[PDB]
């Protein structure tokens, strides 16, 4: 028979059995005449310290081959997998993420053990590029929080613009923590362009919105272009109407992402164990301080593994980190209500029949460009 454990951490108990079912079905999928999977798991902790032990004691404990990581979808639990990815990074156990989106985790060679099915906030910056492909946004301003997220959101936008004859008219940057932004927005307003881009936290986003409403920038020819988070929770609740805040399709759909990860892990673990020279993972977390020579090799198989007919579309990863290239859904605000105007498929913006209001209750698409 042979057993190969797959560790997991999730939201509720109601996901445990929604992980446990997935290991069932994708064993009814996978031939099973050679190897046979089993389903190890435990719920999540809010206090990041416990989580790590709960990986060590509950999970890394049982010779685990991978750790599926997901949580309460609040913006305070996007640093729960931190402890989980050090604790699984020490050993080179592949850490599948199901839901977390801050970009430190993808980032060019920092979490050497961290997979994920969900492309980060910083890939929004290629959809913004495609917002500016269509509609013809020639003169942008970009403000971003001065943090890991914001820099990896701005640079990744700048590198797509660099091959264009363009960049930001002015790039702008504030404090990730500041409750006063009045200052910077002044010179921001006093400029030639009229279509302003933001990659900021729900709270840091809030400040600048109502701070830029206080300081008269909401309507006329102006056009506010942002992403998700900049329209989730406390951003939006002080935003303008006329904004185009993006939203990731099935971006908070846990039991749809778990479904993929066990299938991809099944279509990787059978892609692993078919190989001559394959090694057992290391046993417990205490007094064990060495990797398993199929740690990277499982992960380097994990990164290069396809999977048509997923749920959140087709699961495929890239070079830099390893993140999917899933459809977004371009939202628009009209009377304190987010209502879809278009759909960026994997690659480009295809808009629906719905008509799109602009800032100050504008029927006509403005231009940037002074007015």
């Amino acid at each position: 028979p042979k057993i190969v454990n797959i560790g997991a951490v999730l939201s509720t108990r109601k996901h445990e059995q929604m992980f446990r079912e997935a290991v069932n079905q994708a064993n009814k999928r996978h031939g099973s005449w050679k190897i046979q999977l089993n389903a190890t798991s435990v719920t999540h902790k809010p206090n990041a310290i416990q989580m790590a032990l709960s990986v060590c004691e509950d999970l890394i404990s049982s010779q685990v081959y991978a750790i599926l990581v997901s949580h309460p979808p609040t913006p305070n639990d996007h640093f729960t997998p931190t402890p989980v990815s050090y604790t699984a990074g020490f050993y080179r156990i592949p850490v599948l993420g199901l839901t977390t989106r801050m970009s430190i985790y993808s980032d060019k060679s920092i979490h050497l053990s961290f997979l994920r099915t969900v492309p980060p906030y910083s890939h929004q910056s290629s959809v913004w590029f495609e917002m500016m492909r269509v509609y013809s946004w020639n003169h942008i301003i970009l403000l971003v929080s001065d943090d890991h997220e914001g820099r990896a959101a701005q640079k990744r936008l700048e590198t797509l613009l660099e091959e264009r004859e363009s960049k930001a008219e002015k790039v702008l940057q504030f404090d990730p923590g500041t409750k006063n932004v009045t200052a910077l927005l002044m010179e921001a307003k006093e400029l030639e362009a009229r279509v302003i881009i933001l990659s900021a936290s729900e709270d840091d986003a809030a400040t600048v919105y109502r701070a830029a409403a206080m300081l008269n920038m909401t309507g006329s020819g102006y056009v506010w272009l942002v992403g998700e988070r900049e329209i989730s929770g406390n951003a939006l609740r002080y935003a303008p109407d006329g904004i185009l805040g993006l939203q990731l399709i099935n971006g908070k759909n846990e039991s749809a992402h778990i479904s993929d990860a066990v299938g991809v892990v099944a279509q990787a673990v059978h892609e692993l164990l078919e190989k001559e020279n394959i090694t057992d993972p290391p046993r417990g977390c205490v007094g064990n301080t060495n990797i398993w020579k199929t740690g990277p090799l499982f992960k380097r198989v994990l990164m290069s593994s396809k999977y048509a007919d997923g749920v959140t579309g087709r699961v495929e990863f890239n070079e830099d980190g390893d993140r999917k290239f899933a459809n977004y859904s371009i939202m628009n605000l009209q009377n304190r209500k987010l209502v879809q105007v278009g759909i960026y498929n994997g690659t480009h913006v295809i808009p629906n029949d719905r008509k799109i209001i602009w800032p100050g209750g504008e029927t006509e698409k403005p231009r940037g460009y002074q007015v």
Partner: antibody, heavy 120, light 111 residues
Framework: QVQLQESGPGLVKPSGTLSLTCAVS?????????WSWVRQPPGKGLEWIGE???????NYNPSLKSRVTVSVDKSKNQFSLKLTSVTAADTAVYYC?????????????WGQGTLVTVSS | NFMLTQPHSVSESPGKTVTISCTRS????????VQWYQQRPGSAPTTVIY?????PSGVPDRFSGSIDSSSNSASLTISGLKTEDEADYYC?????????FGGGTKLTVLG
């Protein structure tokens, strides 16, 4: 100095059309607000229906997204609500109201209010 | 969408101070602007309180409002209650999907 007056409070058949309408006084329609509708079954609270901008862009309530239409007329300075397929529960008073808009939903001034009696 | 829940009926003596709870189910209350309506019987509704706690010209200081962040409830309060505070009452919030109203409060003036 803005006012709003709505159509005759009549009978409507089971599985039928609602046909209501609302002139605008002391003001315009192309003004930056949203023109909209609400309803109250007698001896009960309120309940929203949908809205229409001066352009004709529209926004319906999810519980009725399939049964409602709001339309406009930029000459009379009037608009109108239609609400099809009606039943027993749809027996109510109906108010059109100006949704003061630059952010929120906030209804001022309201309509007078007209009872569409849904019966045979 | 989220269902606002009010006290079915409230009551309080004249010249006093009475409180009106507007409990929002899902999503934080202070997030979205809350308003308040006095629907006079056999009359169509009229704002008493706009923008959580912003008051029109003519509606008196006895009409005030506050938003309990911690209980998830807007509170319409009237002090110095009069015989003309006997009326129906309705809070109104919204979200990304709809325009919600409360279940309502019947306020009879005790004594």
């Amino acid at each position: 100095q803005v006012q709003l007056q709505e159509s005759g409070p009549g009978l409507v058949k089971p599985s039928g059309t609602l046909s209501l309408t609302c002139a605008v006084s002391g003001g315009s329609i192309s003004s930056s607000n949203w023109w909209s509708w609400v309803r109250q079954p007698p001896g009960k609270g309120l309940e929203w229906i949908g809205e229409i901008y001066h352009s004709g862009n529209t926004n319906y309530n999810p519980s009725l997204k399939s049964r409602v239409t709001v339309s406009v007329d930029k000459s009379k300075n009037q608009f109108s609500l239609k609400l099809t397929s009606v039943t027993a529960a749809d027996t109510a008073v109906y108010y059109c109201a100006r949704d003061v808009s630059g952010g929120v939903n906030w209804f001022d001034p309201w309509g007078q209010g007209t009872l569409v009696t849904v019966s045979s | 969408n989220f269902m606002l829940t009010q006290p079915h009926s409230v009551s309080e003596s004249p010249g006093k101070t009475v409180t009106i709870s507007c409990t929002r189910s899902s999503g934080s209350i202070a997030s979205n602007y809350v308003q308040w309506y006095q629907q006079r019987p056999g009359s169509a509704p009229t704002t008493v309180i706009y923008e959580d706690n912003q008051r029109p010209s003519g509606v008196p200081d006895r009409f005030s409002g506050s938003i309990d962040s911690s209980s998830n409830s807007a509170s319409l309060t009237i002090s110095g209650l009069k015989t003309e505070d006997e009326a129906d009452y309705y809070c109104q919030s919204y979200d990304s999907s709809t325009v919600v109203f409360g279940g309502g409060t019947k306020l009879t003036v005790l004594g």
